[PDB]
Amino acid sequence: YDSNSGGEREIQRTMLELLNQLDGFDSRGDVKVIMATNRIETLDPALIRPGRIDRKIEFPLPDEKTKKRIFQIHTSRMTLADDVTLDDLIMAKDDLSGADIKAICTEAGLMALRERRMKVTNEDFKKSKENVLYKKQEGTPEGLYL
Amino acid sequence: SRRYDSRTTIFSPEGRLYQVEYAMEAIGHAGTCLGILANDGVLLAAERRNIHKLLDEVFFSEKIYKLNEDMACSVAGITSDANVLTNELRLIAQRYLLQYQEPIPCEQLVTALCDIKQAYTQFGGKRPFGVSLLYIGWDKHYGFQLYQSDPSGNYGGWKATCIGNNSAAAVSMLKQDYKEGEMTLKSALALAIKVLNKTMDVSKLSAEKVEIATLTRENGKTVIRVLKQKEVEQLIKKHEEEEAKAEREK
Amino acid sequence: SYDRAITVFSPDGHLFQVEYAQEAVKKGSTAVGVRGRDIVVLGVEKKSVAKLQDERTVRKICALDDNVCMAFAGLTADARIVINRARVECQSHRLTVEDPVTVEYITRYIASLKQRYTQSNGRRPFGISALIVGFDFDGTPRLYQTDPSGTYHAWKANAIGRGAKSVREFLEKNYTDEAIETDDLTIKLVIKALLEVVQSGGKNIELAVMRRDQSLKILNPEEIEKYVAEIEKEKEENE
Amino acid sequence: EVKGVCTEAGMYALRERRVHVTQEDFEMAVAKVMQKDSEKNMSIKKLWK
Amino acid sequence: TGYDLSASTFSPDGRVFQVEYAMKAVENSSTAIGIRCKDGVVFGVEKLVLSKLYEEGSNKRLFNVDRHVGMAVAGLLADARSLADIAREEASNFRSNFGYNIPLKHLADRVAMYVHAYTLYSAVRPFGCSFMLGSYSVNDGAQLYMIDPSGVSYGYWGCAIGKARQAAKTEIEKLQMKEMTCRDIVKEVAKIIYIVHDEVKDKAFELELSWVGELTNGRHEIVPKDIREEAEKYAKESLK
Amino acid sequence: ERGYSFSLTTFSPSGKLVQIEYALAAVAGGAPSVGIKAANGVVLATEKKQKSILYDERSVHKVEPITKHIGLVYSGMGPDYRVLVHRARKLAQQYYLVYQEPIPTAQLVQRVASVMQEYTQSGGVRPFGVSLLICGWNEGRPYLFQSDPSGAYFAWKATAMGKNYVNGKTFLEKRYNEDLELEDAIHTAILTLKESFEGQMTEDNIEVGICNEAGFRRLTPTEVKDYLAAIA
Amino acid sequence: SSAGFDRHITIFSPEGRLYQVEYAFKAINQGGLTSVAVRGKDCAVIVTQKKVPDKLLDSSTVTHLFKITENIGCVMTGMTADSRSQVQRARYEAANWKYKYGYEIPVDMLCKRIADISQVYTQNAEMRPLGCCMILIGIDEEQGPQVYKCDPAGYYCGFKATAAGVKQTESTSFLEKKVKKKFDWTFEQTVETAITCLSTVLSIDFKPSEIEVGVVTVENPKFRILTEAEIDAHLVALAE
Amino acid sequence: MDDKALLVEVQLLESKTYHALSNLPKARAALTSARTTANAIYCPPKLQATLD
Incomplete structure (x- = not known):
């Protein structure tokens, strides 16, 4: 978009010169550029068209396979006691990311420090699983599709 | 002419249903039913949604409908829609007895209804039903059974299911607390009084806001018991006493 | 009395309702099935059992007659109408012709049921996809499939449900006649395929076979653990 | 809304020039504040049981 | 707009535009008049010829419903032939149940x-026709009727259907009605068709006249047209 | 018609039915009415006005009998009321032809509400805009029920409908007790109808029907003129 | 406001109203006519003017005063095509009362049968609600005269003196001032007020050629349409 | 308990007897409570001129 005011033109010229020096075609010396946003439909179309970028990699959804590593990765650098059961936490909840897993492990660490202990018991993980994960659980067609 | 049609038949462009989803996401509001069994007997705890001081209760069976000599149901949804199905489901069980001189088994009563509920979703553009109801009963093949019904026409066998969306915390309690072949008619009843105490927002569980129907197999009679008033009250006094006794360790 | 066309054409030359119906098959539990020369096998995944509830009513493999076996995906209410429609026809075929029903005859009954059901007026098309398995006379084990449009084929290994193309890829690099030689090798192969899709913690797999002589038998959950253990043992020899 | 009931029960006792308050004063006070568009009617909430 | 699609909906001020639309469809059609003298009814239709476009005597709008009943349709011609079948069929069942001739008031x-x-439902549309009913009977005299697409039907002495509606009945009322033989009225009809519609848009036009009354014994038929041809000879006497 | 038969009432995305809630809005803006059940009979009291001095009161009747012991009033709209009256008249006859016995009051309301619900699900039509008050003294105990455009029945001790019904609801909540007589019930029924009335309360502005155990009885304006002396 | 299609078909509004039916109440006023009904102590007068725009139009096929049965007459306002459809229904169901029941239909019971039919047209959404009014008169045994009014919504009630058409709020306001002063009402007292109300509201002071009077009497229960001469006789008699 | 009309009577009778016993504010308040009760009264046919 081109307006008459002087608040938007400082973006467009910087964008236009970027597409110019990306495709300067004088001597680039094989410089690899990786660009990433969340959404794609509200972007600049001439950066999409070939001659510019020919790799459009999508990063789809999850599963209960990739989670168990991230549980183990986030529960590695802590005083993980020998009384904790993470497998019950894995099977029960069925939609969470690693940023959810991180928020579980931190709340588990906080609950252990409220009761003036060093190690963390399973109960701090159970409450952290029930506390933190209740912020977005909304919308499912259960028992309709086998 | 054709521009007034609401098109309840077409799939979503998402590739799923669109109108039946509205009724199933409606059905969790305003109504709380449950039922339990692990041994000889099965119960149905209900919840009086509005108890105003100017009503009569001349019927002594408000939500529970004794649809047969061996079965009953607990409906939660549109009240007017309930009278349509329960008049129909009662007549399904009776033409079976005319044909076979034998009491209707409980599964093929449920599949008889759910095929009626499905067919009014596909063809006609008719409004689907807004009813999810439960089933108790006894037969000669398995015995004491529970069933869940959906507005889609989908059903299932259960042991501690419910209906209302306020009872999502109750099913978590039932996964936390349930036994395998240890129902008495004290154990399951005190457990059901424990559930509606926490899940419903009624303070101290007024005995006129709940309703309990049980079913036992007496000799050959399959007595459907509907308990009236004071046994509920002394049950609550029993439950509050067991709460007051157990909190002494705190 | 309902006169309203529901399924019409599109300007590019496609339909709308059939492509919307096959999404419901895509949002369903996976069920695979292979065959052999003497015995067949089919299983299903994504049980997701509440583990405190009844499960004799959650069965999603049934039989039309003493030869023909079922395995569907999609939604469940529309499957029940198709099954009770098909049990009547294979029983009425036995009334006129004194044979057992051939497995090819009943798949033409289901597919012709579903095609005239997308053709007519006022009628939402079905949302299932069946796997029809049965060994005919002269001992000819075979399996067919359906489609919500009403087409049908003959495969050697099918997969449907949520994530069949991964399973179809896993069966694609599995083109061995030796796996269809030993009976228990074929069954662990299905368990190898189903564990490749679902998380499969030994309680989410329901397989069932048919030895072309007897009605179908659901295997015992000890045998599911017995087959998964020898699958783990044979896979542990990768070194 | 607890404050509003306390103010309305106070205002009812003001116009009577009285330093006392009844149970009925609060009953008309809550009924003043409980003025919503989801009207009671007994039929909005019982048809959906 | 928004209210003018069906015949079932009303307007926000309370009329029906689909009837209003079909009324001006008849208005964009050629002129047809009807007048009764003291012992009969005379029909007159201006009929357009484009260059050749048919024979001499195709698609006449002087239908003949009963033995003593005439038509003077104007508007959409296909729907006019439908009403002629309906009006024919109605008079026959009167003859079958009863067994004297149909009165024109019925x-x-x-x-x-x-x-x-056809002005109630969203299924069907209103007809785009309007027409004249002319009869004669020795027990009832002659009567002349007039139907619009809405259905409002009652009696006239002289009416006119088509583009020249107000312009033609301006000079119909200049005449007399009781002091006229219909044979005098025949040449009086032909001047009015000749007066109105100057040939600026359409050069060729025909003139079909039909005539029921005392002299035709109640039987309705066309005038002897090629016979005696006194209408057009008298009609073109009005050059100034 | 053609064969359309499509239901013009479907579920909201919230999960409620829209037209029935709008039909309840027409009932709430209707003429006020009251009904009281008082341990020996039930009293129906409506409130009938006339926009002019030119109308006639011996013509349109609000309290309408059904069998010989079952009365019926309404609070919603007028022409839709007379439809389901004639429907209920015939509906009580198939009971009496078959069973040779006067229909119980609970048995009508199961049948009338079944007419009214099934009417809303079917296509091409709108729901009714009428709520009812049915009463009767069958088998000793009297009865008082209330229906609605949704098709749901209730069993009141004393309710009110029409305009300002919540004001009449709180009034009966203090006025009604465990038990009264029939005449005391008439005196409090005129009292609660005089809450939201206008200044002229003559024998023509109200219209009252009772149910004895002796039977249904509609009150003539002579007694209502005589009973309104020192009313409320 | 407007939700769904509440401006188009007969469904409800969010305000608890509907709109098609109250459009039909002012679908009468496109007729451009006003009719007055007055009931006396032993009579019942119907008075209605007529507008004759064309000299080429009869003075016989125009008047809205119709005869349902030999003891029941009526008058129609609103549009004309919907009016005569309403009258054939009333003629048809009056005769079925004779064939089924044996005795003559009361004038009160007929208005129920009409208002039930108008209810259904309001009720089912795929058809038009017929905007036209209805006023009946007649003499009942042991009840005297009656005057009723059916409406396109579907309700009726008895009256003492009530007009319809275009001008009511001036016509009913005058009739209230006439009735509440408690005068006598014999025959010519009743006829003169039915003229002078329509005279003062319309403010015409006309010639006896436009209005028609359809009185019924206790002594002569036959529905009777008055002659133009005796209409002139009453008009000069009340004139001082 | 229940009543509305007789309450209008006793408020007027007190606002006289405070004015009889020379009370300006309280009789003014008892009159004002008498007015706002009388506003919802459907019929002051005679009590109106008494209240006025």
Whole structure:
């Protein structure tokens, strides 16, 4: 978009010169550029068209396979006691990311420090699983599709 | 002419249903039913949604409908829609007895209804039903059974299911607390009084806001018991006493 | 009395309702099935059992007659109408012709049921996809499939449900006649395929076979653990 | 809304020039504040049981 | 707009535009008049010829419903042939049940109900026709009727259907009605068709006249047209 | 018609039915009415006005009998009321032809509400805009029920409908007790109808029907003129 | 406001109203006519003017005063095509009362049968609600005269003196001032007020050629349409 | 308990007897409570001129 005011033109010229020096075609010396946003439909179309970028990699959804590593990765650098059961936490909840897993492990660490202990018991993980994960659980067609 | 049609038949462009989803996401509001069994007997705890001081209760069976000599149901949804199905489901069980001189088994009563509920979703553009109801009963093949019904026409066998969306915390309690072949008619009843105490927002569980129907197999009679008033009250006094006794360790 | 066309054409030359119906098959539990020369096998995944509830009513493999076996995906209410429609026809075929029903005859009954059901007026098309398995006379084990449009084929290994193309890829690099030689090798192969899709913690797999002589038998959950253990043992020899 | 009931029960006792308050004063006070568009009617909430 | 699609909906001020639309469809059609003298009814239709476009005597709008009943349709011609089948069929069942001839007061009523029935539903549309009913009987005299697409039907002495509606009945009322033989009226009709519609848009036009009354013994038929041809010879005497 | 038969009432995305809630809005803006059940009979009291001095009161009747012991009033709209009256008249006859016995009051309301619900699900039509008050003294105990455009029945001790019904609801909540007589019930029924009335309360502005155990009885304006002396 | 299609078909509004039916109440006023009904102590007068725009139009096929049965007459306002459809229904169901029941239909019971039919047209959404009014008169045994009014919504009630058409709020306001002063009402007292109300509201002071009077009497229960001469006789008699 | 009309009577009778016993504010308040009760009264046919 081109307006008459002087608040938007400082973006467009910087964008236009970027597409110019990306495709300067004088001597680039094989410089690899990786660009990433969340959404794609509200972007600049001439950066999409070939001659510019020919790799459009999508990063789809999850599963209960990739989670168990991230549980183990986030529960590695802590005083993980020998009384904790993470497998019950894995099977029960069925939609969470690693940023959810991180928020579980931190709340588990906080609950252990409220009761003036060093190690963390399973109960701090159970409450952290029930506390933190209740912020977005909304919308499912259960028992309709086998 | 054709521009007034609401098109309840077409799939979503998402590739799923669109109108039946509205009724199933409606059905969790305003109504709380449950039922339990692990041994000889099965119960149905209900919840009086509005108890105003100017009503009569001349019927002594408000939500529970004794649809047969061996079965009953607990409906939660549109009240007017309930009278349509329960008049129909009662007549399904009776033409079976005319044909076979034998009491209707409980599964093929449920599949008889759910095929009626499905067919009014596909063809006609008719409004689907807004009813999810439960089933108790006894037969000669398995015995004491529970069933869940959906507005889609989908059903299932259960042991501690419910209906209302306020009872999502109750099913978590039932996964936390349930036994395998240890129902008495004290154990399951005190457990059901424990559930509606926490899940419903009624303070101290007024005995006129709940309703309990049980079913036992007496000799050959399959007595459907509907308990009236004071046994509920002394049950609550029993439950509050067991709460007051157990909190002494705190 | 309902006169309203529901399924019409599109300007590019496609339909709308059939492509919307096959999404419901895509949002369903996976069920695979292979065959052999003497015995067949089919299983299903994504049980997701509440583990405190009844499960004799959650069965999603049934039989039309003493030869023909079922395995569907999609939604469940529309499957029940198709099954009770098909049990009547294979029983009425036995009334006129004194044979057992051939497995090819009943798949033409289901597919012709579903095609005239997308053709007519006022009628939402079905949302299932069946796997029809049965060994005919002269001992000819075979399996067919359906489609919500009403087409049908003959495969050697099918997969449907949520994530069949991964399973179809896993069966694609599995083109061995030796796996269809030993009976228990074929069954662990299905368990190898189903564990490749679902998380499969030994309680989410329901397989069932048919030895072309007897009605179908659901295997015992000890045998599911017995087959998964020898699958783990044979896979542990990768070194 | 607890404050509003306390103010309305106070205002009812003001116009009577009285330093006392009844149970009925609060009953008309809550009924003043409980003025919503989801009207009671007994039929909005019982048809959906 | 928004309210003018069906015949079932009303306007926000309370009229029906689909009837209003079909009324001006008849208005964009050629002129047809009808007048009764003291012992009969004379029909007159201006009929357009484009260059050749047919024979001499195709698609006449002087239909003949009963043995003593005439038509003077104007508007959409295909729907006019439908009403002629309906009005024919109505008079026959009167003959079958009863067994004297149909009175003209009923045949106006029985047809206009069928016109009115197509102005209610969203299934069907209103007819785009309007027409004249002319009869004669020695017990009842002559009567002349007039149906619109809405269904409002009653009696006239002289009416006119088409583009020249107000312009033609300006000079019909200049004449007399009781002091006229219909044979005098025949040449009086032909001047009015010749007066109106100057040939600026359409060069060629025909003139079909039909005539029921005392002299034709109640039987309705066309005038002897090629015979004696006194209308057009008298009509073109008005050059100044 | 053609064969359309499509229901013009479907579920909201919230999960409620829209037209029935709008039909309840027409009932709430209707003429006020009251009904009281008082341990020996039930009293129906409506509130009938006339926009002019030119109308006639011996013509349109609000309290309408059904069998010989079952009365019926309404609070919603007028022409839709007379439809389901004639429907209920015939509906009580198939009971009496078959069973040779006067229909119980609970048995009508199961049948009338079944007419009214099934009417809303079917296509091409709108729901009714009428709520009812049905009463009767069958088998000793009297009865008082209330229906609605949704098709749901209730069993009141004393309710009110029409305009300002919540004001009449709180009034009966303090006025009604465990038990009264029939005449005391008439005196409090005129009292609660005089809450939201206008200044002229003559024998023509109200219209009252009772149910004895002796039977249904509609009150003539002579007694209502005589009973309104020192009313409320 | 407007939700769904509440401006188009007969469904409800969010305000608890509907709109098609109250459009039909002012679908009468496109007729451009006003009719007055007055009931006396032993009579019942119907008075209605007529507008004759064309000299080429009869003075016989125009008047809205119709005869349902030999003891029941009526008058129609609103549009004309919907009016005569309403009258044939009333003629048809009056005769079925004779064939089924044996005795003559009361004038009160007929208005129930009409208002039930108008209810259904309001009720089912795929058809038009017929905007036209209805006023009946007649003499009942042991009840005297009656005057009723059916409406396109579907309700009726008895009256003492009530007009309809275009001008009511001036016509009913005058009739209230006439009735509440408690005068006598014999025959010519009743006829003169039915003229002077329509005279003062319309403010015409006309010639006896437009209005028609359809009185019924206790001594002569036959529905009777008055002659133009005796209409002139009453008009000069009340004139001082 | 229940009543509305007789309450209008006793408020007027007190606002006289405070004015009889020379009370300006309280009789003014008892009159004002008498007015706002009388506003919802459907019929002051005679009590109106008494209240006025």
